[PDB]
Design an enzyme around this catalytic site. Structure first.
Site, PDB file in Angstrom:
ATOM      1  N   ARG B 231     -28.330  70.470   8.341  1.00 48.13           N
ATOM      2  CA  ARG B 231     -28.164  70.167   6.926  1.00 48.13           C
ATOM      3  C   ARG B 231     -27.787  68.724   6.746  1.00 48.13           C
ATOM      4  O   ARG B 231     -27.054  68.152   7.557  1.00 48.13           O
ATOM      5  CB  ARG B 231     -27.063  71.039   6.333  1.00 48.13           C
ATOM      6  CG  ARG B 231     -27.456  72.489   6.114  1.00 48.13           C
ATOM      7  CD  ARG B 231     -28.379  72.593   4.932  1.00 48.13           C
ATOM      8  NE  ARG B 231     -28.819  73.943   4.635  1.00 48.13           N
ATOM      9  CZ  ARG B 231     -29.897  74.527   5.117  1.00 48.13           C
ATOM     10  NH1 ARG B 231     -30.683  73.919   6.005  1.00 48.13           N
ATOM     11  NH2 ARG B 231     -30.203  75.747   4.716  1.00 48.13           N
ATOM     12  N   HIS B 279     -37.647  68.480   4.681  1.00 51.40           N
ATOM     13  CA  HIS B 279     -36.974  69.764   4.894  1.00 51.40           C
ATOM     14  C   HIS B 279     -37.984  70.883   5.155  1.00 51.40           C
ATOM     15  O   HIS B 279     -38.046  71.904   4.453  1.00 51.40           O
ATOM     16  CB  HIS B 279     -36.028  70.062   3.751  1.00 51.40           C
ATOM     17  CG  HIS B 279     -35.018  71.116   4.065  1.00 51.40           C
ATOM     18  ND1 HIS B 279     -33.783  71.135   3.465  1.00 51.40           N
ATOM     19  CD2 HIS B 279     -35.049  72.184   4.897  1.00 51.40           C
ATOM     20  CE1 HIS B 279     -33.095  72.171   3.904  1.00 51.40           C
ATOM     21  NE2 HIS B 279     -33.838  72.819   4.776  1.00 51.40           N
TER      22      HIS B 279
HETATM   23  N1  LIG Z   1     -34.401  72.186   8.485  1.00 52.03           N
HETATM   24  C1  LIG Z   1     -34.788  73.431   8.306  1.00 52.03           C
HETATM   25  O1  LIG Z   1     -35.918  73.715   7.862  1.00 52.03           O
HETATM   26  C2  LIG Z   1     -33.854  74.562   8.615  1.00 52.03           C
HETATM   27  C3  LIG Z   1     -32.519  74.388   8.826  1.00 52.03           C
HETATM   28  N2  LIG Z   1     -31.702  75.429   9.252  1.00 52.03           N
HETATM   29  C4  LIG Z   1     -30.273  75.214   9.493  1.00 52.03           C
HETATM   30  O2  LIG Z   1     -29.973  75.568  10.834  1.00 52.03           O
HETATM   31  C5  LIG Z   1     -28.670  76.157  10.845  1.00 52.03           C
HETATM   32  C6  LIG Z   1     -28.464  76.966  12.116  1.00 52.03           C
HETATM   33  O3  LIG Z   1     -29.155  78.197  12.043  1.00 52.03           O
HETATM   34  P1  LIG Z   1     -28.902  79.300  13.162  1.00 52.03           P
HETATM   35  O4  LIG Z   1     -29.062  78.752  14.540  1.00 52.03           O
HETATM   36  O5  LIG Z   1     -29.725  80.467  12.748  1.00 52.03           O
HETATM   37  O6  LIG Z   1     -27.334  79.577  12.846  1.00 52.03           O
HETATM   38  P2  LIG Z   1     -26.370  80.367  13.873  1.00 52.03           P
HETATM   39  O7  LIG Z   1     -25.266  80.929  12.992  1.00 52.03           O
HETATM   40  O8  LIG Z   1     -27.097  81.321  14.760  1.00 52.03           O
HETATM   41  O9  LIG Z   1     -25.693  79.250  14.770  1.00 52.03           O
HETATM   42  C7  LIG Z   1     -24.761  78.306  14.289  1.00 52.03           C
HETATM   43  C8  LIG Z   1     -24.167  77.591  15.473  1.00 52.03           C
HETATM   44  O10 LIG Z   1     -23.361  76.533  14.960  1.00 52.03           O
HETATM   45  C9  LIG Z   1     -22.083  76.620  15.567  1.00 52.03           C
HETATM   46  N3  LIG Z   1     -21.022  76.116  14.680  1.00 52.03           N
HETATM   47  C10 LIG Z   1     -20.762  76.404  13.389  1.00 52.03           C
HETATM   48  N4  LIG Z   1     -19.723  75.763  12.903  1.00 52.03           N
HETATM   49  C11 LIG Z   1     -19.282  75.010  13.954  1.00 52.03           C
HETATM   50  C12 LIG Z   1     -18.200  74.121  14.110  1.00 52.03           C
HETATM   51  N5  LIG Z   1     -17.346  73.825  13.102  1.00 52.03           N
HETATM   52  N6  LIG Z   1     -18.026  73.519  15.320  1.00 52.03           N
HETATM   53  C13 LIG Z   1     -18.875  73.813  16.316  1.00 52.03           C
HETATM   54  N7  LIG Z   1     -19.922  74.643  16.287  1.00 52.03           N
HETATM   55  C14 LIG Z   1     -20.078  75.207  15.061  1.00 52.03           C
HETATM   56  C15 LIG Z   1     -21.868  78.084  15.849  1.00 52.03           C
HETATM   57  O11 LIG Z   1     -20.838  78.233  16.806  1.00 52.03           O
HETATM   58  P3  LIG Z   1     -20.284  79.689  17.213  1.00 52.03           P
HETATM   59  O12 LIG Z   1     -21.396  80.281  18.040  1.00 52.03           O
HETATM   60  O13 LIG Z   1     -19.054  79.334  18.029  1.00 52.03           O
HETATM   61  O14 LIG Z   1     -20.004  80.417  15.952  1.00 52.03           O
HETATM   62  C16 LIG Z   1     -23.252  78.459  16.334  1.00 52.03           C
HETATM   63  O15 LIG Z   1     -23.435  78.065  17.690  1.00 52.03           O
HETATM   64  C17 LIG Z   1     -28.638  76.925   9.531  1.00 52.03           C
HETATM   65  O16 LIG Z   1     -27.279  77.183   9.122  1.00 52.03           O
HETATM   66  C18 LIG Z   1     -29.372  76.043   8.541  1.00 52.03           C
HETATM   67  O17 LIG Z   1     -28.454  75.159   7.874  1.00 52.03           O
HETATM   68  C19 LIG Z   1     -32.222  76.716   9.456  1.00 52.03           C
HETATM   69  C20 LIG Z   1     -33.496  76.968   9.220  1.00 52.03           C
HETATM   70  C21 LIG Z   1     -34.444  75.913   8.783  1.00 52.03           C
END
Ligand SMILES: NC(=O)C1=CN([C@@H]2O[C@H](COP(=O)(O)OP(=O)(O)OC[C@H]3O[C@@H](n4cnc5c(N)ncnc54)[C@H](OP(=O)(O)O)[C@@H]3O)[C@@H](O)[C@H]2O)C=CC1
Ligand SMILES: NC(=O)C1=CN([C@@H]2O[C@H](COP(=O)(O)OP(=O)(O)OC[C@H]3O[C@@H](n4cnc5c(N)ncnc54)[C@H](OP(=O)(O)O)[C@@H]3O)[C@@H](O)[C@H]2O)C=CC1
Ligand SMILES: [Cl-]
Ligand SMILES: [Cl-]
Lengths: 316, 316
Positions: B231, B279
């Site tokens: 994001r 995006h």
């Molecule tokens: N550009 C685009 O077209 C798109 C963008 N996206 C973005 O990709 C993001 C990720 O999607 P997805 O992989 O499915 O989400 P997931 O929930 O599967 O994974 C999120 C990851 O981020 C980590 N995380 C979250 N907060 C923190 C933090 N404060 N510090 C460290 N690590 C953190 C989580 O850690 P933990 O495992 O420890 O919880 C986890 O490993 C979405 O939220 C969306 O914003 C998604 C689809 C399309």
């Protein structure tokens, strides 16, 4: 011990860097060094060559094995006085992995409409385009050898549908293959055509307007793409240009050209859906090349068969 | 049976095409259709939403499950009157495979010096550049979730060295991972930084000049690259620009921006080592989205737990 002649038209700094500690116990005679321009090269058993000078084999008449600096041997086979001894081509994980990078990059650039998004960016225009996934595209690879097989497996792992063609049918998990007579069926299924064939008399001018007209129009873009990193002599550039102009080809990635370096006057430099690279799809890692040559020399001198020996009649 | 509300700011032709045969036995109320602009939406149990209008939840007060049209939920969590019921995010093989395509493309574009070769092509100049292989580059992925894990595995298979970072340490074959406290060690090893984090209050502005200054300068280009498809709110664009200008960052691929659509006045459109996409790193396949929603509805109504439910306090 026999010296090793090195006559490689590669980036000089890379060859120079790799010479350090290469061929331990042997004199290494790098013909890029002016100090060696008059050295008589009789009695020397081994040479590693790429784009070598026309007189090389008259200077070095006693070679026992010739090593190509590349996978392709179409040029070295033409060198005057090429000796009647084994010619060993370069096959190595470093070369293969590099080619697959380049092939994957082209398939993604075309799939993901990179030129369209760049044209939008030039206008400072934010616009999302409808987008197929890799599985919606069939990549068809002509040449199912070391490079073709690795590229096919990697493309399939990234989600592309992949099929292959070569003279004989090859058995590859997750990749349907076709033999020589299956060419037309193969072309009719192919959205992105990838060339990884050697240049031989039988592959000269194979990529022509008649062939491009047999490629699929049923894919997500309604028009096929041509990607070549084999040899330039396998394509008819007049036809590529005609087909790009008319829309028979929707785009192309060309790493290789009928006459290299590509003329500054070529239309290819400025065409909106052509990617030009200067014969860099898979660079030879000179350290890895010298390790390969060392290994083959050791096999040769121990009485073991050389590996990767070319069939000079077939041209590969 | 309850109708299903569809309020998706996607390409309209894609949503319209997917409506045919979707949600069999239920009325589907597509809020992109002007015919539905006054329809009272009380008593309806399910909505599938993306960039929905501020009044949606006041019109539909009886929702039992809210379905995001995307993997990210940072926007839907802000919608006024978001009901205190499960919010289900989109997780699907189609979305994952698409993200990995985009990530792979960026890593290859940067590895293979695409902008340099394009600049050479613009001058009609044939010049081979010294070229590292993928294994010479460490890609470091921040966010080891559905998208981060798939991208890591695929990058590793293509030859990159890959490491990962997230809050908790994840166990992934062939990919060393780091937990929150390991951030600095992780950054110092990273040549190409890939962002696949959600936007949350804890990830807001995380990609800033101090972070870019901790990235490795020991890689083959002597300067790191920043690639973000998480994001825009997680990055500080003023710092990205400063760092590109100074050479602290050697290049970037940005799919997401602090304010979208990206202003036409942004410097990013014209910068020589920045790739801008609007995006589109992983588009939602609307057919697959509706299959996913159908499956979750069936689970819900049979008394089985919903899958992919977000923690509204954590924001993901
Ligand atoms: N550009 C685009 O077209 C798109 C963008 N996206 C973005 O990709 C993001 C990720 O999607 P997805 O992989 O499915 O989400 P997931 O929930 O599967 O994974 C999120 C990851 O981020 C980590 N995380 C979250 N907060 C923190 C933090 N404060 N510090 C460290 N690590 C953190 C989580 O850690 P933990 O495992 O420890 O919880 C986890 O490993 C979405 O939220 C969306 O914003 C998604 C689809 C399309
Ligand atoms: N652009 C670049 O930087 C580089 C380009 N190359 C080029 O790539 C080529 C391929 O290398 P590599 O994969 O190692 O070579 P291989 O010898 O391993 O494979 C060649 C393949 O081409 C097929 N073939 C040859 N002639 C014909 C024909 N007439 N009809 C049908 N199929 C044919 C062979 O079929 P069969 O199996 O039946 O014999 C085989 O499948 C090289 O010759 C070189 O020209 C290589 C390295 C770098
Ligand atoms: Cl074109
Ligand atoms: Cl830049």
């Amino acid at each position: 011990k026999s010296p090793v002649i090195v006559d490689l038209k590669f980036i000089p700094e890379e060859v120079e860097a790799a010479l350090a500690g290469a061929f331990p116990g042997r004199e290494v005679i790098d013909l890029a060094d002016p100090a060696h321009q008059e050295r008589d090269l009789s009695g020397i058993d081994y040479a590693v060559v790429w784009k070598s000078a026309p007189d090389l084999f008259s200077r070095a008449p006693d070679l026992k094995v010739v090593f190509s600096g590349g996978a392709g041997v179409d040029h070295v086979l033409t060198l005057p006085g090429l000796p009647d001894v084994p010619l060993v081509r370069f096959v190595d994980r470093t070369l293969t992995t590099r080619m697959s990078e380049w092939v994957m990059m082209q398939c993604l650039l075309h799939l993901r409409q990179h030129r369209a998004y760049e044209a939008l960016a030039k206008k400072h225009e934010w616009r999302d385009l409808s987008q197929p996934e890799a599985a919606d595209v069939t990549v068809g690879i002509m040449g199912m050898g070391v490079l073709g097989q690795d590229a096919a497996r990697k493309l399939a792992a990234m989600g592309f549908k992949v099929i292959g063609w070569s003279r004989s049918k090859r058995v590859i998990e997750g990749v349907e293959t076709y033999d020589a007579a299956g060419l037309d069926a193969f072309l009719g299924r192919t959205d992105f055509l990838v060339g990884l064939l050697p240049l031989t008399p039988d592959t000269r001018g194979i990529f022509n307007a008649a062939l491009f007209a047999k490629l699929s129009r049923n894919g997500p873009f309604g028009a096929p793409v041509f990607i070549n990193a084999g040899r330039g002599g396998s394509q008819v550039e007049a036809d590529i240009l005609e087909c790009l102009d008319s829309g028979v080809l929707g785009g192309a990635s060309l790493d290789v050209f009928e006459r290299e370096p590509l003329s500054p006057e070529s239309r290819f430099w400025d065409m909106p859906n052509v990617y030009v690279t200067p014969h860099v799809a898979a660079s030879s890692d000179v350290r890895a090349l010298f390790v390969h040559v060392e290994h083959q020399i050791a096999r040769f001198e121990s009485g073991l068969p050389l590996e990767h020996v070319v069939d000079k009649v077939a041209g590969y």
